[PDB]
């Protein structure tokens, strides 16, 4: 059924599973027209499909041409997400196909279930976790590839860099969710924390600074301070 804090270790077992987050598929800017009406302009988006055990991220870039001449785009976006996840599963060898797909938003359940009718043994599940995957576009190298895209494209990443050489999946997912929550809560301050020391750089083949185990502890502390600081500013605490 639903995935929550009670069955959290299930994320890191040896049954292949993917999270699917659709919050950045259909993205728009809102503006006034010459006549003083309001119009939207779509910008490129992405599906965030992540294996939480291995860090493998299947970033499907959604180019604005897929919306051309279509109606009810917020509805279509869920169905396009499900179509693309279905296509990804079919593209994978049998022994790499997931046994469970966890959607971050419950409105994805019916579209995905319908697109996956050919796979009756893949469980489609919601979650009660509030996951910060909408902040994926705050990771510079992901935002860059999405914005530069001129056509539909799939790009593969490891969202954990080489962190699994020294820590467990459980801890890597915890670090990722803390980093993304901080970027969602105060993007400018979070990026300042990550780039404040010019001597620590991001490898060409990585998404995040090559921090040591001790520096990651400091960074994680600073991220928690940021989140708490923002909570106090918000609620006047």
């Amino acid at each position: 059924g639903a995935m929550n804090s009670s069955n959290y270790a299930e994320l890191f077992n040896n049954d292949i599973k993917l999270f699917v987050d659709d919050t950045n598929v259909y993205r728009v800017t809102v503006h006034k027209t010459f006549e003083g009406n309001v119009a939207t302009k779509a910008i490129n988006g992405c599906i965030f499909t992540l294996n939480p055990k291995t860090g493998h991220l299947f970033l499907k870039i959604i180019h604005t041409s897929v919306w051309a001449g279509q109606k009810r785009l917020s509805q279509l976006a869920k169905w396009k997400t499900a179509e693309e996840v279905s296509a990804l599963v079919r593209s994978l060898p049998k022994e790499e196909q997931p046994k469970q797909i966890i959607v971050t938003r419950k409105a994805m359940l019916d579209p995905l279930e319908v697109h996956m009718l050919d796979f009756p043994n893949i469980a489609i599940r919601p979650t009660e976790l509030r996951l910060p995957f909408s902040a994926a576009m705050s990771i510079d190298k992901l935002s860059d590839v999405v914005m530069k895209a001129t056509e539909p494209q799939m790009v593969l990443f490891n969202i954990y860099d080489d962190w699994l050489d020294r820590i467990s999946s459980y801890t890597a997912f915890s670090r990722l969710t803390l980093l993304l929550r901080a970027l969602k809560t105060n993007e400018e301050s979070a990026k300042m924390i990550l780039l404040s020391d010019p001597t620590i750089t991001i490898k060409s083949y990585h998404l995040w600074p090559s921090f040591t185990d001790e520096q990651w502890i400091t960074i994680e502390s600073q991220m928690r301070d940021l989140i708490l600081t923002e909570y106090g500013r918000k609620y006047n605490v």
Binding site: L76, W79, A82, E83, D110, P111, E113, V114, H115, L117, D118
Partner: protein, 300 residues
């Protein structure tokens, strides 16, 4: 007019005949029901006074044979049987009629209710839903499960309604997933009407029989089928105009007949609100919407 005699009535029982009902006392001199209108299917149904568990009954058409009821003290129920000796049967009925030991089917002349509830219901189609080929009549009860219910356990005693499942490969063309899920026209018109049912009359017959079994026996699976067949039409953007107009009539008479006090158990809020206010056909069911709003406004 035809007659279903009773050998006797050894146990106190409420007897239904179509939408009518009457109480019979233990060992009362009751010997059956006369003046049954030819031309329609009928249902004779029972609920025992000492055990309201298991409502049960029999669908029959007097044009297909001479049928009577006899209590079986071993199996503890009133059983329908066919009498093949015609002269014996006429002799039995005549004596019971002369002694006025029968109730008369209490049809008012102005009243088309039973025709309106059974317009598309055929005995031959009932006998395919309820499989017991050695009899010409069909037993149904409150507990019988449907083929669909079983899939999700004795198949000889099941209700073989046509399986309708909105999230199934039968309902969704590969490549048309969003289209077919949001607009069920291809499932209704190509799969169900052209493919399985062959025509709208057979589709409405099954819908009508499902409602009747839900109402007369409290058969849950039948209620599920009735709502599924309504929702399939209402969730289709392309439906022939004659089907929409006939559906409005069918449902109007069903809502009209439903006991006011069973609305809480026989009507699905989600389905009815979707069908009347959100669906493609939200404005095509004017008579049904009007009776629903005036009789069961709480459900909406």
């Amino acid at each position: 007019m035809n007659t279903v005699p009773f050998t006797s009535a050894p146990i106190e029982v409420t007897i239904g005949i179509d939408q009518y009902s009457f109480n019979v006392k233990e060992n009362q001199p009751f010997h059956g029901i006369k003046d049954i209108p030819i031309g329609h299917v009928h249902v004779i149904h029972f609920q025992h006074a000492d055990n309201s568990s298991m409502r049960y009954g029999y669908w029959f058409d007097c044009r297909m044979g001479n049928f009577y009821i006899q209590y079986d003290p071993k199996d503890g129920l009133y059983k329908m049987m066919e009498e093949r000796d015609g002269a014996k049967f006429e002799n039995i009925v005549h004596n019971f009629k002369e002694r006025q030991m029968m109730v008369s089917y209490p049809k008012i002349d102005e009243d088309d209710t039973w025709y309106n509830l059974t317009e598309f219901v055929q005995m031959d189609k009932i006998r395919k839903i309820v499989r017991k080929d050695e009899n010409q009549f069909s037993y149904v009860d409150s507990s019988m499960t449907t083929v669909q219910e079983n899939e999700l356990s004795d198949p000889a005693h099941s209700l073989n309604y046509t399986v309708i499942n909105f999230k199934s490969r039968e309902a969704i063309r590969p490549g048309h997933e969003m289209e077919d899920f949001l607009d069920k026209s291809y499932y209704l018109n190509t799969v169900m009407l052209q493919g399985i049912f062959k025509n709208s009359s057979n589709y409405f017959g099954e819908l009508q029989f499902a409602f009747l079994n839900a109402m007369f026996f409290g058969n849950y699976g039948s209620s599920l089928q009735w709502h599924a067949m309504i929702e399939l039409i209402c969730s289709s953007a392309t439906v022939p105009k004659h089907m929409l107009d006939k559906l409005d009539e069918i449902l109007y008479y069903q809502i009209k007949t439903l006991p006011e006090q069973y609305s809480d158990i026989l009507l699905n809020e989600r389905v009815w609100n979707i069908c009347l206010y959100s669906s493609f056909q939200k404005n095509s069911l004017h008579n049904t919407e009007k009776i629903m709003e005036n009789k069961y406004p709480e459900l909406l």
